[PDB]
């Protein structure tokens, strides 16, 4: 019957499980005793982007490091000049229940969605001097939580069904869809070589798939519901933010679990993570109106960006590596440095 | 000591502000509701009530004006049962409609004090609907269903003396409708600070009186947040 | 990886006693809120009984209020819990479940087979 499908399967994780501790043979935190600290290091408010009416959600950097995208709850999507601090395009949305955004690698296209479980295509440089829909892909039964662009004709969609979708824009199809995860699959990072994607679900397990084999590689197993993931530049490891006040840096080669990042006076959750241009500097966002960044290799806690009211929820870094983007429910934008 | 473009990108980043100051007015105008509910509930006949005035749309709209103000009613139809990460949404609703019916009760219960106890939906009202109170009446008369096998604190109860019935039909009936609503008013009871109240009502699918009654108690919130602001209460 | 074992299931004579056991492991138990739940033959899934983190808090359904006790040890990281009297109609499929964020006084648990925090369930019968 069932019972012996279960006792196979509580088997072969125990299997795994001894072959991984028999894979283990150091703590990074031992090697890690000679670097020297990486200090102090103290951050200012440089520009302060306002103009939105409700809650900034999420937003997005441009590939030039000039422009960035932002979506707010009052049904918009403002285009930004970070220099100057213009206003470039105030494209307005159908539906008002917008949570992701994303900007096109070329710089011709933008995405949003929402509840509205349909993912809306923009179109920047047009004939005329307006932005028009271009494509709305709608074949989803939950909600979308974040969408990535891999070229001009792919994007990939993460959404509250315990699925993720690979999409063609000039068709408007399902080239693949990915199945296996159990509770609402929230966050999606892409890896530099395009070829490797990481997902993060409401079970406390993390996913690697394959793009043309369509199949799962990897499964890392937190102790509650996981907000944020994002790639090391390498391309080797990945760092996940749960709800348990915790960051873990996992690494693909050796499937385990490197450091965590806690400490005893922090107990709201996180919701934004990431690294910088050097892969030095861990930035995460919590929901005490504060954002912290750790040096993630001794797991110290270096300097605070304080500067907000409510809760922050989208955080961002450049590509060149010399702005970070924060937002919160406080309808405001800010860029440290 | 700007160029010829900068200027007049300066000019077209001075008229997308005017838009969207212009585009202000009607934001702050209009009430917003998010209107919850189970499945038995007659939440579907309410809706089609209120119209007095695309296959796997997660999300639905409604418009009405009364007392010339307009107000908006969302509604969620295509979503799962789990339910803990899209209620972060409505943290600036003006108001909750929910709808329980009288005829699993439990369950309501548990939804209520769920919903009343969230961090992020504080500072939210909740408008609390018992429909369904013309069957209430046919199933106490029956007699055939006793109340007291589900609930075994419903012998020592007596019909407060603040209870007004409109109509004289029965006093069993009046005992069984304030129980339940006694049993509701005893989870918002527990709390502090004063910062969201309850406004029962007892209501029927087919009462055409819902839209006063969603007005009344938007004005009664309207008038205590700004009473409470300036020191008056 | 979190998981929750539970035990005492079988079968009993009417106005008989019966003890369960949960056991957990992968989290810090001394931070997460408890609860019970059973599902009836043909019937949707259904709220007991739960205990907070600290044990001051107690509450249970009105159909076995009376008759059936809930307690925690978390220097062993067990949830029990102890029935008494039982009836006809309190034979099911028990489970013992975990609040998802730790420090609150809220919870979404009774879910049509989709939660994730949740045993495997003991069948417990009684005639």
């Known amino acids: 019957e069932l019972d012996q499908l279960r006792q196979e399967a509580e088997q072969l994780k125990n299997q795994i499980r001894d072959a991984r501790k028999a894979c283990a043979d150091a703590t990074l935190s031992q090697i890690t005793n000679n670097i020297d600290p990486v200090g102090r290091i103290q951050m200012r408010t440089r520009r302060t982007l306002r103009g939105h009416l409700a809650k900034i959600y999420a937003m997005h950097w441009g590939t030039d490091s000039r422009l960035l995208v932002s979506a707010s709850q009052d049904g918009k999507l403002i285009i930004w000049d970070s220099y100057t601090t213009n206003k470039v395009h105030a494209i307005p949305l159908r539906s008002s229940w917008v949570m992701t955004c994303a900007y096109a690698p070329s710089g011709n296209y933008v995405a949003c969605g929402g509840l509205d479980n349909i993912c809306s295509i923009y179109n920047l440089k047009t004939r005329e001097g307006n932005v028009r829909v271009s494509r709305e892909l709608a074949g989803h039964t939950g909600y979308l939580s974040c969408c990535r662009f891999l070229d001009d004709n792919q994007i990939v969609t993460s959404s509250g069904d315990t699925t993720c979708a690979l999409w063609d824009i000039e068709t408007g199809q399902q080239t693949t869809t990915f199945t296996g995860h159990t509770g609402d699959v929230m966050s999606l990072s892409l890896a530099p070589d395009t070829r490797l994607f990481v997902s993060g679900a409401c079970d406390a397990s993390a996913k690697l798939w394959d793009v043309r084999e369509g199949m799962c590689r990897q499964t890392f197993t937190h102790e509650s519901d996981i907000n944020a993931i994002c790639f090391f530049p390498n391309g080797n490891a990945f760092a996940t933010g749960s709800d348990d006040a915790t960051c873990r840096l996992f690494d693909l080669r050796a499937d385990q679990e490197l450091m965590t990042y806690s400490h005893d006076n922090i107990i709201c959750g996180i919701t934004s993570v990431s690294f910088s241009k050097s892969g030095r500097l861990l930035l995460a966002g919590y929901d005490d109106f504060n954002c912290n960044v750790w040096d993630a290799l001794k797991a110290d806690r270096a300097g605070v960006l304080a500067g907000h009211d409510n809760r922050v929820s989208c955080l961002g870094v450049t590509d060149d590596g010399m702005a970070v983007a924060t937002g919160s429910w406080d309808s405001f934008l800010k860029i440290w440095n | 000591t700007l160029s010829a473009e900068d200027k007049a990108a300066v000019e077209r980043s001075k008229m997308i502000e005017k838009q969207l100051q212009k585009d202000k007015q009607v934001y702050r105008a209009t009430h917003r509701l998010l209107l919850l509910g189970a499945d038995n509930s007659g939440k579907s006949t309410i809706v089609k009530q209120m119209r007095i005035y695309v296959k796997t749309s997660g999300i639905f709209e409604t418009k009405f004006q009364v007392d010339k103000v307009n107000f908006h009613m969302f509604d969620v139809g295509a979503q799962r049962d789990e339910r803990r990460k899209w209620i972060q949404c409505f943290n600036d609703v003006t108001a909750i409609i929910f709808v329980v019916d009288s005829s699993r009760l439990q369950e309501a219960l548990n939804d209520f004090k769920s919903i009343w106890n969230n961090r992020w939906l504080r500072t939210i009202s909740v408008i609390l609907f018992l429909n369904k109170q013309d069957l209430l009446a046919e199933k106490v008369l029956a007699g055939k269903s006793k109340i007291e096998d589900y609930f075994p604190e419903f012998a020592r109860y007596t019909t407060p003396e603040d209870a007004t019935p409109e109509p004289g039909e029965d006093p069993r009936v009046t005992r069984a409708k304030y129980f339940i609503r006694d049993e509701f008013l005893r989870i918002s009871t527990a709390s502090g600070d004063g910062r969201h109240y309850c406004y029962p009502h007892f209501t029927c699918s087919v009462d055409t009186e819902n839209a006063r009654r969603i007005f009344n108690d938007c004005r009664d919130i309207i008038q205590r947040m700004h009473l409470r602001q300036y020191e008056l209460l | 990886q979190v998981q929750l074992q539970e035990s005492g299931g079988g079968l009993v004579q009417p106005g008989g006693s019966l003890r369960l056991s949960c056991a957990a492991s992968?989290?810090?138990?001394?931070?997460?809120?408890m609860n019970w739940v059973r599902q009836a033959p043909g019937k949707g899934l259904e709220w007991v009984s739960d205990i907070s983190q600290s044990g001051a808090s107690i509450s249970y359904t009105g159909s076995v209020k009376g008759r059936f006790t809930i307690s925690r040890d978390n220097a062993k990281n067990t949830l029990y819990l102890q029935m008494n009297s039982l009836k006809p109609e309190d034979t099911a499929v028990y489970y013992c479940?975990?609040?998802?964020?730790?420090?609150?006084?809220?919870?979404?648990?009774?879910?049509?087979?989709?939660?994730?925090?949740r045993g495997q369930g003991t069948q417990v019968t009684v005639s």
């Open positions: 992968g989290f810090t138990f001394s931070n997460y809120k």
């Open positions: 479940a975990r609040c998802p964020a730790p420090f609150t006084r809220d919870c979404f648990d009774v879910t049509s087979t989709t939660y994730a925090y």
